[PDB]
């Protein structure tokens, strides 16, 4: 490109891989949201928590694609793998799956930041620090808080606890 | 001082000791608040209850220092001891620790009032009656109410009760 | 912690030490503020300058503790040493002490940033760059400006100059 | 009186003496205010500081007379002695005279409070604590602050300092 | 040009030289403004006085370039010489340098007006009378007033005077 400066082919490829990862995560959260809308599951606040995450992760992919074109890189899309499960269990199982997925996104962000640092690409480092790394730490902390609250509610009356969480936290 | 009148060295020293006690209590409540913000504890209303108490106790120290200078006494600061615990247990354990601490502050206020009375210092007596003694009785009553509500919630489903208290009272 | 990722024990400990340093600085500024409120000192703008700094440094400690829990580290509080002086001299002496203290906080921030960089912790580096390093440079520049203005006012009429500074700058 | 209860003849007489003292102080401050309005003195902020104090002390006398009738005591007025000086010197001399006068009022208030306490008259004790003792401590602290600021301004250019104080503090 | 009428090559060249002179003066005032923002100089009102002059002189250059194109002349830019000093001394030294610079701009304006008059170019004469000559006389009078006020403040307490000027005039 006429505009490309200081933007390695390694970073360009890793940004494309990260876009795939974010779109995969959006699709996983779409599947989690619609599972909680099942008439035999029926946890509306859980459905809305995951549907909002699906939108967030799509928006993160769109911001990475915007940056890829601002740097003069070329977006390359790959197939999007289906989510790992078709049914997601309890709200506890689902929130455990969600923190595993967000940990994996965070590790991908950290790996890209490290690549950027090795390539002396400060605009990439800044972009990630500014729009991704703190949002991901904040999200992971929120999920961990949720996770602890769900766990303390299981006790010996798991249905009751699952209802309450949904009603009073989500 | 040019302005000092009717202000004994005994009262001056005891006001400095009370400032230390209030600042110690602010620090204890800061530690309690951040313990309830842990991802493995995650009781937001409990965190906010103690963080608000940390601010109150700091403000009480600042009011005592203001009065010390209005009387012509001299503020003398000492080291502030760390809180008694690093981890605070359950919300019940924490509220028991908080009432023990507020009882000890109240006894210090009563002891200063008695000193004032023995020194015939009515401005000191009035200052304490006006800004401290009723606030402390009101706080201790609120903690005792909380304490009773937490206790009735333990039953055989302690996690559930701890969640509910947090959600519906705090 | 379930949420901890990329957060070294070295950084965790250094954040706890920095919290102690910020709380120590808040306590120093509380002592400076109340010294200028003495009836025999009576520099209201000087008192308000330091009282505002006490609040800032407390808020900096609270932000570090928030981040410590967002990363899955554990807050550990230590005793808070009393300020270095009981009486702080002239406004010049006090502003010299304040710049020495802010230089020492800045060096602690830089040392933590360096640790973060050695540990490849970009979220820590970003957090410090975002909330601490520019605020500290801005503060140190303001104190240096004050310092120069106080110095030019001493001349042969130090009382007059101290009054004027207080009245017309603070 | 039909309404008198728990109100000793000693307290009644001492309240009448305190009314005389407050009215004397109002008259002293009237003389101080008009001295600073002299064309050969011409310190407008000093004049307004003392004129406001004249009004305060008159209002304090009126509140004591109101209380005397609410208790069923009988107001008895005596001659009001002229102020101690006809010309009041510098603003420093005048503020020294004003703090001497306020110290003497405070000692009279404390003496009445002690009498009340010896007579087991809590309504009198409360009335003084509520409307007089803290106002007098606040005033004496303000005068002491002023006093320190005037003193630091004398230096070797006393006229300049007196102008500045008036202009920038009062 | 198709539009050029009554616009001599001598005037065209002198307008280009005047643009250089105005841009040089803008750069001088930028250097003066940032010198007064030094932490070891720290005269904020002095910094703002010169920074505003830097903007004025840039705007004067832009108005001359606008007029050059409205007449069908051709802008020709030359190198811009650095300011005459790197450090500017006291506010007195700086205001003396500023009046020397404004006198030199005024003499350049008068010389161009004279050229215009010799070339019978009334649109040029009007343009200068309308947008430059009275603004320059007003500015030079303001600087001279400042200069007199700074001079009366030096006395035997130059620091004090420099502070006061900055605080109370600028
Ligand atoms: Na939405
Ligand atoms: Na951005
Ligand atoms: Na609050
Ligand atoms: Na009060
Ligand atoms: Na504030
Ligand atoms: Na932030
Ligand atoms: Na009035
Ligand atoms: Na009343
Ligand atoms: Na401007
Ligand atoms: Na025009």
Domain CATH for A58: 1.20.1260.10
**Out of C149, C154, C164, whose CB is closest to E42?**
C149
Q: How many CB atoms sit inside 10 A of residue E130's CB?
A: 10
Q: Could you give the CA distance from residue E139 to residue D125 in angstroms, rounded to a whole number?
A: 69
Q: Which two tokens stand for residue D35?
A: 């001295």
Q: Could you give the CA distance from residue C169 to residue C157 in angstroms, rounded to a whole number?
A: 18
Helix axes B44-70, B91-118, angle to 10 degrees: 10
**8 A C-beta contact, residue B104 and residue B24:** no
Q: How many CB atoms sit inside 10 A of residue A79's CB?
A: 7
Q: Could you give the CA distance from residue D103 to residue D110 in angstroms, rounded to a whole number?
A: 10
Q: Could you give the CA distance from residue A39 to residue A37 in angstroms, rounded to a whole number?
A: 6
Best E90, E161, E163 member to test C by mutation, with max C CBs in 10 Å, is E163
Residue whose C-alpha is closest to residue C87's, from C39, C43, C129, C31: C31
Burial of C46 from C-beta contacts in 10 A (0-12 / 13-18 / 19+)? buried
Best C39, C158, C165 member to test D by mutation, with max D CBs in 10 Å, is C39
Q: Give the CA distances from residue C148 to residues A72, C51, C96, C166, D36, in Å, rounded to whole numbers and listed in that order.
A: 49, 21, 11, 14, 37
* DSSP conformational letter for D91: H
**Out of E40, E157, E164, whose CB is closest to C148?**
E40
Q: Could you give the CA distance from residue B61 to residue B21 in angstroms, rounded to a whole number?
A: 8
Query: For the range D107-113, what are the long-range contacts, defined as Cβ-Cβ under 8 Å and sequence gap of 24 or more?
Result: D107/B5, D108/D17, D108/D18, D108/D21, D109/D18, D109/D133, D109/D136, D110/B5, D110/B6, D110/B120, D110/B122, D111/D14, D112/D11, D112/D14, D112/D15, D112/D18, D113/B122
Residue whose C-alpha is closest to residue C163's, from C48, C53, C46: C46
CB contact under 8 A, A149 and B164: no
Residue C79 phi/psi, 5° resolution?
Answer: -60, 145
Please state the separation of Cα A68 from the chain's center in Å.
19
Burial of B155 from C-beta contacts in 10 A (0-12 / 13-18 / 19+)? exposed
DSSP string, B66-98: HHHHHTT-------BPPPS-S---SHHHHHHHH
Q: Which two tokens stand for residue A88?
A: 């997601």
Q: Could you give the CA distance from residue D161 to residue D149 in angstroms, rounded to a whole number?
A: 9
DSSP string, E96-147: HHHHHHHHHHHHHHHHHHHHHHHTT-HHHHHHHIIIIIHHHHHHHHHHHHHH
Q: Could you give the CA distance from residue B32 to residue B46 in angstroms, rounded to a whole number?
A: 9
Q: Could you give the CA distance from residue E152 to residue E165 in angstroms, rounded to a whole number?
A: 10
> Residues with Cβ < 8 Å from D123, sequence gap 6 or more?
D6, D71
> Residues with Cβ < 8 Å from B165, sequence gap 6 or more?
B91, B146, B149, B150, B153
Q: Could you give the CA distance from residue E14 to residue C21 in angstroms, rounded to a whole number?
A: 64
Q: Could you give the CA distance from residue B83 to residue D110 in angstroms, rounded to a whole number?
A: 41
SS3 label, residue B24:
helix
**8 A C-beta contact, residue A137 and residue C66:** no
CB contact under 8 A, E42 and C157: no
Per DSSP (E only), the strands in chain C are none
CB contact under 8 A, A164 and B163: yes
Alpha helix (H) residue ranges in D7-157: 9-36, 44-70, 91-118, 122-128, 134-152
Residue whose C-alpha is closest to residue C141's, from A157, E77, A9, E44: E44
Q: Which two tokens stand for residue D11?
A: 């307290």
**8 A C-beta contact, residue B96 and residue B147:** yes
Q: Could you give the CA distance from residue D32 to residue E18 in angstroms, rounded to a whole number?
A: 65
Q: What is the CA radius of gyration of chain E?
A: 18
Q: Please give the torsion angle defined by the CA atoms of residues B137, B138, B142 and B147, in that order, rounded to the nearest 10 degrees.
A: 0
End-to-end CA distance of chain C: 47
Q: Give the CA distances from residue D124 to residues C72, D72, D109, D132, E70, in Å, rounded to whole numbers and listed in that order.
A: 59, 13, 11, 11, 88
Residue whose C-alpha is closest to residue E64's, from E129, E131, E10: E131
Distance B67 CA to ligand 4 centre (A): 9
Which chain A residues touch B if contact means CB-CB below 8 Å? 141, 144-149, 151-157, 160-161, 164-165, 168-169
> Residues with Cβ < 8 Å from B160, sequence gap 6 or more?
A152, A153, A155, A157, A160, A161, A164, B153
- Per the structure, how many domains does chain B have? 1
Quote the Cα angle for E124-E129-E135, to 5°.
Answer: 130
CB contact under 8 A, C70 and A103: no
Residue B80 phi/psi, 5° resolution?
Answer: -100, 115
Q: Could you give the CA distance from residue C138 to residue C24 in angstroms, rounded to a whole number?
A: 20
Q: Could you give the CA distance from residue C149 to residue A44 in angstroms, rounded to a whole number?
A: 63
Query: For the range C143-148, what are the long-range contacts, defined as Cβ-Cβ under 8 Å and sequence gap of 24 or more?
Result: C143/C95, C143/C98, C143/C99, C143/C102, C144/C99, C144/E39, C144/E40, C144/E42, C145/E39, C145/E42, C145/E44, C146/C95, C146/E42, C147/C92, C147/C95, C147/C96, C147/C99, C147/E39, C148/E39, C148/E40, C148/E41, C148/E42
Q: Could you give the CA distance from residue D128 to residue D113 in angstroms, rounded to a whole number?
A: 7
Q: Could you give the CA distance from residue A40 to residue A161 in angstroms, rounded to a whole number?
A: 17
Q: Could you give the CA distance from residue A17 to residue A114 in angstroms, rounded to a whole number?
A: 15
* Nearest ligand to the CA atom of C129: 6
Q: Give the CA distances from residue D122 to residues B122, D60, D112, in Å, rounded to whole numbers and listed in that order.
A: 12, 19, 12
Q: Give the CA distances from residue C49 to residues C53, C55, C99, C169, in Å, rounded to whole numbers and listed in that order.
A: 6, 10, 13, 11
Distance E14 CA to ligand 10 centre (A): 19
Task: Report whether B162 belongs to an annotated binding site.
Answer: no
Quote the Cα angle for D100-D104-D108, to 5°.
Answer: 170
End-to-end CA distance of chain A: 47
Please state the separation of Cα E83 from the chain's center in Å.
13
Residue whose C-alpha is closest to residue B106's, from B55, B73, B146, B143: B143
Residue whose C-alpha is closest to residue A116's, from A73, A78, A61, A147: A73
**Out of A146, A152, A168, whose CB is closest to B162?**
A152
SS3 label, residue C80:
strand
Residue whose C-alpha is closest to residue C132's, from C72, C74, C62, C70: C62
Residue B135 — left, alpha, or beta (φ > 0 → left; ψ -120 to 50 → alpha)? Answer: alpha
**8 A C-beta contact, residue C22 and residue C58:** yes
Q: What is the number of CB-based contacts under 8 A between chain C and chain D? A: 43
Alpha carbon of C37: minimum distance to chain E alpha carbons (Å): 25
Burial of D87 from C-beta contacts in 10 A (0-12 / 13-18 / 19+)? exposed
- Give the chains touching D; criterion: ≥3 Cβ pairs < 8 Å: B, C
**Out of D103, D117, D137, whose CB is closest to B123?**
D137
Q: Could you give the CA distance from residue B137 to residue B107 in angstroms, rounded to a whole number?
A: 11
Q: Could you give the CA distance from residue B128 to residue C4 in angstroms, rounded to a whole number?
A: 47
> Residues with Cβ < 8 Å from C79, sequence gap 6 or more?
B79, B80, B81, B82
Q: Could you give the CA distance from residue C130 to residue A126 in angstroms, rounded to a whole number?
A: 11
> Residues with Cβ < 8 Å from B84, sequence gap 6 or more?
B28, B97
Alpha carbon of D146: minimum distance to chain B alpha carbons (Å): 11
Burial of B145 from C-beta contacts in 10 A (0-12 / 13-18 / 19+)? exposed
Helices (H) and strands (E) in chain A, counts: 6, 0
**8 A C-beta contact, residue B54 and residue C85:** no
Domain boundaries, position A122: 1-170
> Residues with Cβ < 8 Å from D113, sequence gap 6 or more?
B122, D124, D125, D128, D129, D133
DSSP string, A48-114: HHHHHHHHHHHHHHHHHHHHHHHTT--------PPPS-S---SHHHHHHHHHHHHHHHHHHHHHHHH
Annotated binding site of D for Fe cation: 52, 55-56, 59, 62
Alpha helix (H) residue ranges in C42-90: 44-70
Query: Residue A14: CA atoms inside 13 Å, Cβ hemisphere, count?
Result: 19
Distance B52 CA to ligand 3 centre (A): 5
Query: Which residues on chain B are in Cβ contact (under 8 Å) with D130?
Result: 126
By the CB criterion, residues less than 5 angstroms from ion ligand 7 are D 55
CB contact under 8 A, C163 and D157: no
Residue whose C-alpha is closest to residue B44's, from B82, B91, B97, B84: B91
Resolution of the solved structure (Å): 1.4
**Out of C2, C3, C123, whose CB is closest to A134?**
C123
Helices (H) and strands (E) in chain C, counts: 6, 0
Residue C71 phi/psi, 5° resolution?
Answer: -90, -10
> Residues with Cβ < 8 Å from A143, sequence gap 6 or more?
A95, A98, A99, A102, C3
Quote the Cα angle for C9-C10-C11, to 5°.
Answer: 95
């Amino acid at each position: 490109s006429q505009i490309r400066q200081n933007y390695s082919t390694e970073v360009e490829a890793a940004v494309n891989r990260l876009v795939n990862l974010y779109l995969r995560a959006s699709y996983t959260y779409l599947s989690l949201g619609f599972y909680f809308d099942r008439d035999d599951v029926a946890l509306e606040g859980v459905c809305h928590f995951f549907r909002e995450l699906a939108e967030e992760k799509r928006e993160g992919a769109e911001r990475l694609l915007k940056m890829q074109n601002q740097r003069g890189g070329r977006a390359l899309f790959q197939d999007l793998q289906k989510p790992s499960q078709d049914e997601w269990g309890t709200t506890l199982d689902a929130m455990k799956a969600a923190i595993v997925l967000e940990k994996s996104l965070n590790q991908a962000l950290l790996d890209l930041h490290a690549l950027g640092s090795a390539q002396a690409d400060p605009h990439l480092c800044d972009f990630l620090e500014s729009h991704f790394l703190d949002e991901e730490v904040k999200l992971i902390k929120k999920m961990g808080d949720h996770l602890t609250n769900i766990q303390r509610l299981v006790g010996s009356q798991a249905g009751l606890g699952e209802y309450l969480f949904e009603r009073l936290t989500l």
